[PDB]
Design an enzyme around this catalytic site. Structure first.
Site, PDB file in Angstrom:
ATOM      1  N   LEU A  85     -22.039  -4.895 -18.730  1.00 55.62           N
ATOM      2  CA  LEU A  85     -23.131  -4.118 -19.288  1.00 55.62           C
ATOM      3  C   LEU A  85     -22.931  -2.640 -19.004  1.00 55.62           C
ATOM      4  CD1 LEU A  85     -26.065  -6.272 -17.952  1.00 55.62           C
ATOM      5  CD2 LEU A  85     -25.038  -6.310 -20.239  1.00 55.62           C
ATOM      6  N   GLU A  86     -22.957  -1.859 -20.100  1.00 57.23           N
ATOM      7  CA  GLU A  86     -23.055  -0.402 -20.153  1.00 57.23           C
ATOM      8  C   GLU A  86     -24.279   0.106 -19.450  1.00 57.23           C
ATOM      9  OE1 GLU A  86     -24.250   1.116 -24.303  1.00 57.23           O
ATOM     10  OE2 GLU A  86     -25.036  -0.951 -24.545  1.00 57.23           O
ATOM     11  N   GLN A  87     -24.131   1.256 -18.822  1.00 56.19           N
ATOM     12  CA  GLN A  87     -25.207   1.865 -18.075  1.00 56.19           C
ATOM     13  C   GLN A  87     -26.638   1.499 -18.549  1.00 56.19           C
ATOM     14  OE1 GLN A  87     -23.897   6.094 -18.279  1.00 56.19           O
ATOM     15  NE2 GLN A  87     -23.329   5.951 -16.106  1.00 56.19           N
TER      16      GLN A  87
END
Ligand SMILES: CC(=O)N[C@H]1[C@H](O[C@H]2[C@H](O)[C@H]3[NH+]=C(C)O[C@H]3O[C@@H]2CO)O[C@H](CO)[C@@H](O)[C@@H]1O
Ligand SMILES: CC(=O)N[C@H]1[C@H](O[C@H]2[C@H](O)[C@H]3[NH+]=C(C)O[C@H]3O[C@@H]2CO)O[C@H](CO)[C@@H](O)[C@@H]1O
Ligand code: NA
Ligand code: NA
Lengths: 528, 528
Positions: free
Chosen positions: A130-132
C-alpha cells in the site's frame, strides 16, 4: 501448479503489469514475459492488484494488461512454469494510486476475490504494498488484515501455505507507526516483510558513535543497511521488531527504478549482511523494484543487463537456510499514569502471542506491584514464555495527584448593612473526590454595619483524613451608600464655600482656588 | 532593554523579515512593524537568521529587510519597547533555504556572531528553526549545540537567561530521530520547545482505542493534540520526552500560513489542553506561524483580523504558571547483544543529567546482573536520582553464541596410489575462539591403492572443554588412471570385435549392432 511457498532465502522481484514505464533518470522499463525473468528471482510479485474502476465497487481486483502480449491462458501457463521450477508468484496489492479505501464489512468480499484470483491464476500468495495514502485510508487497517486471516486459514485447510508478504516504506515501521496494525494483526500469518529502503531521501536514524545515517548517503550505505536492519531485527531504536528470518531488504535495481536508495557499491551490502550473520542474525534476502527495471534501459538506451541479480543473486542464494526465531510477543504495554487512590489492574489491555500467532495471553505473568494510594513511580515487568523462548518487557506506572480548585473567591465590594454570606457563590472541586464545598473553612469575619476592608482567609482541607490543605484569600470591602461632596480635582476652580472630599475629609474653600490640595494649605490657607 | 525572559505561559509568534509573502491559499502576509504586534504575543521570533551570501562565509547572520520601512535604529527601538512591556524578542535561526551547513571548528565563530547580534539588537534569545535539509547537514548537529552552550554560559556570567527555544517539525521528535542531538546536548539549557504540528499531512500516530490519528484529520484534532502531547510529555509512544512545562504547541494562524494543520475549531484545542491539565501536565503555551499571517489577508483580500490571538491568547494566558518537572534523564541505554563468554561492562556508554543539564553520571546505579558465560536474556535496571525525583529505565542484554564454520570439506576425486592427506586444505573457525583446525577429528580412512568411494566424517569439537560438536561429511573417490575401452552409447554402430565398456565390464560385439545394451542380450546375443 499447486501453492508453491519458499523455505530458504529469497530474492524477490516485482513484475510490471504495464509496458514502457519511465525511469527516475529518463530510462525505460519494458514489459517482459514472466518466463524471461532470471531464475534466481525465486519470488516474483505481480504488480498490482488495485481498484480499476470505482464503478465496479471498492473491492480491488487484477486485470492483466493485454498490451503485454500474453493471453489470459498464456499467463496462467507461464505462472505454471515458474511454479514447476519451485518459484513463487505473488499478487501485489496496492502501488501508486491504488484507489483502495475499504469499509468495515468488506473483509469477506476482499477475501473471496483474493481466493478467486489465486485459484484462477495460480498465485502462491499476496504482498501488501500500500502506497502512503492507502496505508491508513478508511478502514484498510482493519479490513485487509481481517481478509488475509481468512485467506490464510482457507488454504491452511487444504494443507497449503498461502504466502503473505508486505513492502512498507521503512519509515512506517517505527514503534507506533502507520504499518503497526498490519504487523500486529498478521503476526504469525506472514512469511516475510520486505521493507522498501528507498524513496525516503534523508530519512534514516541516529546512531551514537556515527551520527545521522541517511538512506540517501552513499558514503555510509554499509552503516545504513547494518543499523536499520539491526534495529528492526531486535526491535530497538524505536522500530517494530521483524525477526531476522523474516527480514528481506528491499532495494531499487538501478538509478531509474527509484529516486533514491540504489546501492552504488554492492560490497556495502555484502559487508552489512555479513555483519548481521556475524551477530547470529542473518537476513532472509533482498527484494527489488523491479525485474523490468533490471531488464530495462537507461536514458542513452543502454541496457541495464541484469546488473542487480548479477550483484546479489549468488550472494543471497549461497547462504545457510533460515533458522526461525521463536520468541513470543507481548502487546499493549505502554507506560501509564494513574491518579492517587484510583483502582488499577495490571493485566487490562495486555495480550501476547507465540511465534505462530496463537493467543497465549493467559500465560502472561507480572513481576513487581503498584500502590495506587502512594504518589510516585512503580516499575512492573511482564513475561511470557512459549516454545522455550521468553520475552520480557517493562512498564512504568506513575501515581500522581491533582490539586483541587476554588471558585467564587473573588474580591468583592458590598453596601453598608446588607447581609453577607461568605459561602454565597463559593465552592471547591477535585476530579476524583468531587464536590469539596463542605470542606472549606473561613477565617475572619465581615462586619457590614462598619465601613472598611475585611480580609477573609478560605481554607480547603482535602485528601485522606482531610490532611492536605490549600489556602486562598479574599478582600470584602464595605462601602457607605450615603452620597457626599464631590472629590477635589487639581483641575477644577472652586469658590468661597465650595466643598470637596479629599483624603477622607470634607473641606470648604475660603476663596478662589485652582490646583491647591486640600490638607496642604496649613492653618490659615484656602481649605479648612 | 536588558535580557527579557519568560517565566509563565507563552504565546509565541513568528515575525517575517520580508513583505507580502504568498499564502498556501492565495492570501497575503504583509510585513508589519514590531510595535503593531498584538501584546498577548509575549515571545516574538524574528525570522530568520541565515547565510545571506555564501561569499561572506558559512556563519549565518541577520540582515533586516529595509523594505519593511524600519531603519536599523528604529528596529532596535521597537525591540526596546517590547522589552519594556516585559515581552521577549528572539532571533530565529533557519527557515526555508537557510544555506546553513557548518563544519566542526565553526562553533566559536557562530557563538560570537550570536552574541554580537544579541548585543546590537537587543535579542533575548534564539530559536533553532532548521528546515529539513539543515537539521542534519555537515556538522550542524554538533556545531549549533556547541555554540549555544557558550552563548548561554556567557550571558549566565552576567546573571541573564539567554533563552533557547526550538521549532522542530513534530516527526523529527521520535526516539532516535534527527532532532535527537539538539534535544540531548542542550538538555537543561533550553527554555521550551515549540514543535511544528503542521505541514506534515498524514503523519501522526497509532493509538489503540482510536486507531490512526493524522495531523491533517479535522475530525480527530482534539485526539491529535491530546495524544501527541501526552506522548511527548511522558516520552511514550516512541517520542523523546519534553517535559510539559517546556512544551508549547505550534500551529498555523490560518489556512494561508501552512499547507495543513490549522485548527478549524478552537474547542478541540481547549479540550485537548484541559485534558492534559486534568492529568497534572498542563502545557506551557501555543506558538504560531505567524503574526504576519494573523494580520494578513485571504485571497479575496479579506483581512484575517487577528483571529488566532482571538481564539487562543486569553486561553493560554489565563492559566496557572508552569510548575517545573525536575525528573533527571538517563542516556545511552539501548538493548544490547553480547557474545557468549565476552567481557561486558554495564556502565560503559551510560550517562545521566539533572533537570538543569548537570552531569550526574556518577550517581547512576544498576539493578540485576548478566552472565556473559550463559546464553540467554538478562534484564537490567538503571536508576538515578536528583532533586527528589527518580528516573528508572530498563535494558535487555542477550547473550548468544555463534556456530563455527568448516572449510575445505568438499567432495573430491583422486588418482590411484597418490598420497592423500585428509587435513590438506581443511580448517575451522569461530569469531571469538579463532583457529579451530586442531579441534577437528576425522572418522574413516581412504585407501588410495584401492579404487572406490570413501566416506569421511569430519567432527569439530568446540566450546568450553570441547563439549560442543558439529559434523560434516566428505566423499573421497579413488579412480584409476589406466585408460580403457570407450563407453557404449545407444547411438553408435559397432562391428564384430569392437569393444566397449558398459556397467563395469568390457564387452566384444559378435556382429553388427546399434542400440542394444551390453548385458541385456542374454547367453547367445551380440555382446559377450
Ligand atoms: C520508476 C517506476 O517504475 N515508477 C512506477 C511506480 O513504482 C513505485 C511502486 O508503485 C511502489 N511499490 C513498490 C514495491 O516500490 C514503490 O515505489 C516505486 C517507485 O520507484 O509504480 C507506478 C504504479 O503504482 C508506476 O506507474 C510507475 O511507472
Ligand atoms: C506561507 C508562508 O509564510 N511561507 C513562508 C515560509 O514559511 C515556513 C517557515 O520557513 C518554517 N519555519 C516555521 C517556524 O514554520 C515553517 O513552515 C512555514 C511554512 O508554512 O518561510 C519562507 C522562508 O523560510 C518564506 O519564503 C515563505 O513565504
Ligand atoms: Na501456485
Ligand atoms: Na533584550
Amino acid at each position: 501448479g499447486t501453492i508453491t511457498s519458499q523455505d530458504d532465502n529469497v530474492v524477490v522481484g516485482y513484475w510490471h503489469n504495464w509496458c514502457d514505464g519511465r525511469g527516475y533518470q529518463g530510462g525505460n522499463a519494458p514489459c517482459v514475459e514472466l518466463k524471461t525473468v532470471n531464475p534466481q528471482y525465486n519470488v516474483v510479485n505481480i504488480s498490482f492488484m488495485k481498484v480499476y474502476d470505482i464503478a465496479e465497487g471498492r473491492i480491488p481486483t487484477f486485470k492483466l494488461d493485454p498490451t503485454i502480449a500474453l493471453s489470459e491462458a498464456e499467463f496462467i501457463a507461464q505462472i505454471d512454469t515458474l511454479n514447476s521450477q519451485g518459484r513463487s508468484v505473488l499478487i501485489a496489492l496496492g502501488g501508486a494510486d491504488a484507489h483502495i479505501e475499504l469499509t468495515r464489512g468488506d473483509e469477506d468480499a476482499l477475501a473471496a476475490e483474493i481466493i478467486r484470483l489465486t485459484d484462477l491464476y495460480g498465485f502462491d500468495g499476496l504482498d501488501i504494498d500500500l502506497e502512503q495514502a492507502a496505508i491508513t485510508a478508511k478502514d484498510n487497517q482493519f479490513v485487509i488484515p481481517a481478509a488475509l486471516k481468512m485467506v490464510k486459514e482457507h488454504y491452511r485447510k487444504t494443507g497449503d501455505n498461502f504466502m503473505i508478504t508486505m513492502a512498507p516504506e521503512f519509515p512506517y515501521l517505527t514503534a507506533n507507526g502507520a504499518y503497526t496494525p498490519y504487523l500486529t494483526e498478521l503476526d504469525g500469518y506472514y512469511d516475510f516483510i520486505n521493507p522498501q529502503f528507498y524513496n525516503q531521501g534523508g530519512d534514516g536514524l541516529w546512531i551514537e558513535g556515527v551520527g545521522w545515517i541517511a538512506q540517501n548517503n552513499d558514503a555510509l550505505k554499509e552503516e545504513f543497511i547494518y543499523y536499520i536492519a539491526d534495529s528492526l531485527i531486535n526491535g530497538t531504536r524505536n522500530y517494530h521488531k521483524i525477526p531476522h528470518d523474516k527480514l528481506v531488504f528491499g532495494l531499487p535495481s538501478n538509478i531509474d527504478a527509484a529516486a533514491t536508495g540504489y546501492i552504488q557499491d554492492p560490497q556495502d551490502l555484502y559487508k552489512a549482511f555479513d555483519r548481521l550473520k556475524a551477530q547470529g542474525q542473518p537476513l532472509r534476502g533482498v527484494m527489488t523494484w523491479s525485474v523490468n527495471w533490471d531488464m530495462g534501459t537507461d536514458a542513452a538506451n543502454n541496457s541495464y543487463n541484469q546488473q542487480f541479480i548479477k550483484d546479489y543473486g549468488n550472494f543471497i542464494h549461497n547462504q545457510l537456510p533460515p533458522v526461525t526465531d521463536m520468541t513470543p510477543t507481548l502487546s499493549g504495554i505502554v507506560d501509564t499514569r494513574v491518579e492517587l487512590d484510583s483502582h488499577f489492574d495490571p493485566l487490562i489491555g495486555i495480550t501476547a502471542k507465540d511465534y505462530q500467532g496463537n493467543d497465549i495471553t493467559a500465560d502472561v505473568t507480572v513481576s513487581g506491584s503498584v500502590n495506587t494510594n502512594q504518589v510516585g513511580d512503580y516499575l512492573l515487568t511482564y513475561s511470557v514464555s512459549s516454545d522455550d523462548e521468553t520475552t520480557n518487557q517493562p512498564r512504568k506506572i506513575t501515581v500522581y495527584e491533582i490539586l483541587p480548585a476554588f471558585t467564587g473567591i473573588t474580591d468583592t465590594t458590598v453596601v453598608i448593612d446588607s447581609e453577607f454570606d461568605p459561602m454565597q457563590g463559593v465552592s471547591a472541586s477535585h476530579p476524583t473526590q468531587g464536590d469539596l464545598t463542605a470542606n472549606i473553612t473561613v477565617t475572619g469575619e465581615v462586619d457590614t454595619n462598619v465601613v472598611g476592608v475585611y480580609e477573609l482567609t478560605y481554607q480547603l482541607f482535602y485528601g485522606q483524613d482531610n490532611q492536605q490543605n490549600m489556602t486562598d484569600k479574599r478582600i470584602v470591602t464595605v462601602v457607605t451608600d450615603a452620597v457626599s461632596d464631590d472629590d477635589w480635582q487639581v483641575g477644577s476652580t472652586y469658590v468661597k464655600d465650595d466643598k470637596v472630599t479629599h483624603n477622607g475629609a470634607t473641606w470648604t474653600a475660603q476663596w478662589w482656588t485652582k490646583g491647591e490640595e486640600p490638607g496642604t494649605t496649613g492653618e490659615w490657607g484656602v481649605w479648612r
